[PDB]
C-alpha cells in the first residue's frame, strides 16, 4: 500500500512510520512545510503507526532528539515514539479489509487527517487545537498535550486491568476530537476500508 504523508503545517515536522519492532519504509524523514513523502507499506502490515515529531535536531548519522515523538534518538524510527503523539494507526489486509484510526491514547502533538486516496471508505481527522486547550496537568513542556496514562501512570488511565472507564482527561480529548480514540476502551472509531487501499496522512489539515 502507498501512503502519502503531507506536512501542511507552517513548521517542519519529522514524519515517522513504524510497526513497533521495525521501520516502515525508511521509517522517518524531515518534511518542510508543504512537502510530501510517499512510502510503501507491505501488505499484511499489522499495527503500523505514522506520526509527526516536532523540534528535532539530528546529526549527519541520523542521531539526535525531538521534543515530541522521539523514537530512541533516530531520524529513521524502528520503534514507536515518546508521547505526546497524535497517531495514525492501521492494520492492512486483515481478512480482506484494512482498518484505520486516529488515536489520542498517547496524547496529541500535531493535528492530522488520515484519509483513503482510493474508493470505498471515509477518512478521519483530529484537527482541533488540543494543545492550546490542553488541561494544565497534561501540558507537555516540550509542546503537546499528554494523555493521562503517560502523566499519572494509574490503572484507571492506562486501563491496565482491562477494565476502565472514561475520565475527565479522556473526555477532553473526546470533546475536541470525537473521531479519535480517547482512551483504551473508547467506543471504536475504527474505519473499515477495502483491503489494499491507499492513503494520505496530512499534518495540519486545516
Curated annotation (Swiss-Prot):
InterPro entries in the record: Osmotin/thaumatin-like_sf, Thaumatin, Thaumatin_CS
Cystine connections: 9-204, 56-66, 71-77, 121-193, 126-177, 134-145, 149-158, 159-164
Transmembrane regions: none
Keywords recorded for this protein, A-Z: Cytoplasmic vesicle, Disulfide bond, Signal, Taste-modifying protein
Keyword Disulfide bond set for record: yes
Keyword Signal: yes
Record's subcellular location: Cytoplasmic vesicle
GO cellular component terms, A-Z: cytoplasmic vesicle
One Pfam short name: Thaumatin
Sequence similarity: Belongs to the thaumatin family.
Protein purpose: Taste-modifying protein; intensely sweet-tasting. It is 100000 times sweeter than sucrose on a molar basis.
Name of the featured protein: Thaumatin I
Species, as recorded: Thaumatococcus daniellii
